[PDB]
Design a protein around this ligand. Structure first.
Ligand SMILES: Nc1ncnc2c1ncn2[C@@H]1O[C@H](COP(=O)(O)OP(=O)(O)O)[C@@H](O)[C@H]1O
Ligand SMILES: [Mg+2]
Ligand code: NA
Ligand code: NA
Lengths: 92, 387
């Protein structure tokens, strides 16, 4: 489906760069998502900034909240990529 | 440090952890992989789990169980008013909310249902911490599929009071499906039936799973049918036996009846793997030692109606889900009582010889799935997809 394809292409294109993912997550969220505000790279410079924004993001796409919602599959895909990107970021 | 999965059960609770690529169901310090959902208050201490259940006969009015029947309910609820008659402990009304009232350290004390359940969760937390050698904060906790928002929020609150961060409240039948990796399948949707016969309740749930997304299609069962009822059928049998042998009636001695029930539950468990079981009780009533035997055949007979009756909620669930029995892809056994061979035979015959999913200890399956889910939600189970 087009929403799934959109997320797959986002995931491939950003190369598990956590800042690239967070700075563009607004482009892959479902219609009806109203909590997330687009974050610019200026707010993603320091490790402290990245952690704060990552934590906000996982709350939006959390699978527990998403359970039973039309967008559930897509939240799960985004959540798992963010987690992988965060773990890679921590390894640096 | 890992997140844990906790099955907070009506009669027993169970904790697992996914670590090093495998789920461990964690044994308590008495060697038991499940722990009674019992809290006892005494002159000197608060006891939880095995130690609490073990002294019930000596301290019945200050030993609390069945908190899950009160959780998230109003005092004036029909369910609460009905259930209160069966309990030896006091339940009182506090501004519309039910509280258990007990004697503790020579003092009258009362606790909300979520406070009692927090004590059970605290014990399960400690069980996991002993095993892990580190503190446990994050958990997935399970509830019945039919629980409403009030009951779910009260269960979460129990977690918070136990010093846990509850990652998610998920459904018991869904947890069992997750344990078996049923949500990892792809392609056409699949219908799964969960047959869950526990210590106090019987739940039948039909789930449809497609691409790891669950839908609870129907639920059926009996909130007042479980292992305790099978114990009771044995108890009455042996009360008759004792009266005939000794010209004494133990029925009105509450301690003797409880001591006998404990012995019956143990024999029942033995009868799931052996065809006979022996009972030995020192000084059961007025100085008389009670020794006897019972066969698997006799146990099955004593419970014949209750066992075959489990098939009716199965039929009801199937029609509510609008499915034929030939349309069910997987059948999962959950709950300690599904270890009973006669139960397993009855269900398999119903499904015309189809194989049952029982490789995971049925009393551990819910905790097992919760543990998997807790790892996923913590970022500690990457790859494959999301189960
Ligand atoms: N091997 C066994 N054979 C028969 N009954 C058992 C066996 N093991 C446990 N049980 C029964 O299972 C019931 C507890 O079920 P369980 O699923 O562990 O808890 P809960 O119903 O609280 O979730 C008790 O009645 C117990 O006696
Ligand atoms: Mg159970
Ligand atoms: Na249980
Ligand atoms: Na049950």
């Amino acid at each position: 489906d087009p929403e799934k394809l959109k997320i797959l292409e986002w995931i491939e294109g950003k190369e598990r760069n956590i800042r690239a993912l967070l700075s563009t997550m607004h482009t892959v969220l479902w219609a009806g998502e109203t909590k997330w505000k687009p974050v610019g790279m200026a707010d993603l410079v320091t490790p402290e900034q990245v952690k704060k924004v990552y934590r906000k993001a996982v709350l939006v796409v959390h699978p527990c909240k998403a359970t039973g919602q039309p967008y559930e599959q897509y939240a799960k895909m985004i959540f798992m990529e963010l987690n992988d990107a965060w773990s890679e970021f921590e390894n640096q | 440090g890992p997140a844990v999965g906790i099955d907070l059960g009506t009669t027993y609770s169970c904790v697992g952890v996914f670590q090093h690529g495998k789920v461990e169901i964690i044994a308590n310090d008495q060697g038991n992989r499940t722990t009674p959902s019992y809290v006892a208050f005494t002159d000197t201490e608060r006891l939880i789990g095995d130690a609490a259940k073990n002294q019930v006969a000596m301290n019945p009015t200050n030993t609390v169980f069945d908190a899950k029947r009160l959780i998230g309910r109003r005092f004036d609820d029909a369910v609460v008013q009905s259930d209160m008659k069966h309990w030896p402990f006091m339940v009182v009304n506090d501004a519309g909310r039910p509280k258990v009232q007990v004697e503790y350290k020579g003092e009258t004390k009362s606790f909300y249902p979520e406070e009692v359940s927090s004590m059970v969760l605290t014990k399960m937390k400690e069980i996991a911490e002993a095993y892990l050698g580190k503190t446990v904060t994050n958990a997935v906790v399970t509830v019945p599929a039919y629980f409403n928002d009030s009951q779910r929020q009260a269960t979460k609150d129990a977690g918070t009071i136990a010093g846990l961060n509850v990652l998610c409240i998920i459904n018991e039948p869904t947890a069992a499906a997750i344990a078996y990796g049923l949500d990892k399948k792809v392609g056409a949707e699949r219908n799964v039936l969960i047959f869950d016969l526990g210590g106090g309740t019987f739940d039948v749930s039909i789930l449809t799973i497609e691409d790891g997304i669950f839908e609870v299609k129907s639920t059926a069962g009996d909130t007042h049918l479980g292992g305790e009822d099978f114990d009771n059928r044995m108890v009455n049998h042996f009360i008759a036996e004792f009266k005939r042998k000794h010209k004494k009636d133990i029925s009105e001695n509450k301690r003797a009846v409880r001591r006998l029930r404990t012995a019956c539950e143990r024999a029942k468990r033995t009868l799931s793997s052996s065809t006979q079981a022996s009972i030995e009780i020192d000084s059961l009533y007025e100085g008389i030692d009670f020794y006897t035997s019972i066969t698997r055949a006799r146990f099955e007979e004593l419970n014949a109606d209750l066992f075959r009756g489990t098939l009716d909620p199965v039929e009801k669930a199937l029609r509510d889900a609008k499915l034929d029995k030939s349309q069910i892809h997987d059948i999962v056994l959950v709950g300690g009582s599904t270890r009973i061979p006669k139960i397993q035979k009855l269900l398999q015959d119903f499904f015309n010889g189809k194989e049952l999913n029982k490789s995971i200890n049925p009393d551990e399956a819910v905790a097992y799935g919760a543990a998997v889910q807790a790892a996923i939600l913590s970022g500690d189970k990457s790859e494959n997809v999301q189960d």
